[PDB]
Structure formats: C-alpha cells, structure tokens
Amino acid sequence: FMVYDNLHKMETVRNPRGLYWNYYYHVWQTLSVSRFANAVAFVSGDVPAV
Amino acid sequence: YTDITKEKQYDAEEAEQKVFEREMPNVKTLFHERNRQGFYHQTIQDDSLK
C-alpha cells in the first residue's frame, strides 16, 4: 500500500439572511500500490493460461 | 428626513440567493430659498422743518 493524505481541512460560512451555517470538509489524498511488492490473488473460475 | 422601513417575512430558503441584495432607505428632502427683498424710503427736509 502506498496511500498518503495531502489535505484535510474544514471551512465554515454563515448566512445572515437565512440564519444558517454551512460546513465544508475537504479531503485530498493519493491512492496507489507498489509493483515492487509481492501480491498474490486466489481466483476460482475460468482463468486464462497466461 | 429619513423615515421608517418595511418589515419582511423570514425565509431561510430564499435567503440563500438574496444575502447581498440591497434596499435603499426612505429619505426625503426639502429646500428653502430667499423670498423677501424690500426697503423703506423716507425724506427729511432739515431746513424746511427747522
């Protein structure tokens, strides 16, 4: 696993005419896997020869 | 002279797009100018009255 997180933040705004609060939660990440590591999968069914 | 304003009804859902709407105050003006320009004229005959 090569999972990292770049951004994690929260922002708030207020409407003075409607009297409510808006909350936004921003999440930015990188998701990847490494081909240099061993990884075997067990499969049942019709699998190709190669 | 600045006068009173008018009451609006609470509307949270309509407040979403009208937060920056404007409302001009009720202001009235009056002007006063100069009216009267007069004079009084009299004669005094000093010797004739002496």
Place of tokens 């930015």: A28
Q: Please name the residue ranges forming H helices in chain A.
A: none
Instruction: Evaluate whether A32 touches A6 at the Cβ level (below 8 Å).
Output: no
Resolution of this structure in Å? 3.0
Q: What is the dihedral of CA B12, B17, B18, B21, to 10 degrees?
A: 170
For B8, the token pair is 């609006």
Q: What residues of A are in the B interface, CB distance below 8 Å?
A: 15-20
Query: Solved by what technique?
Result: cryo-EM
Give the span between the Cα atoms of A30 and A26, in whole angstroms: 14
- Distance between A37 CA and the closest CA of chain B, angstroms: 52
Closest C-alpha among A23, A31, A29 to residue A7: A29
* A14, A27, A28, B3 from A8: Cα distances, Å: 21, 5, 7, 50
For B29, the token pair is 């003006």
Our CA angle for B2, B5, B10, nearest 5°, is: 155
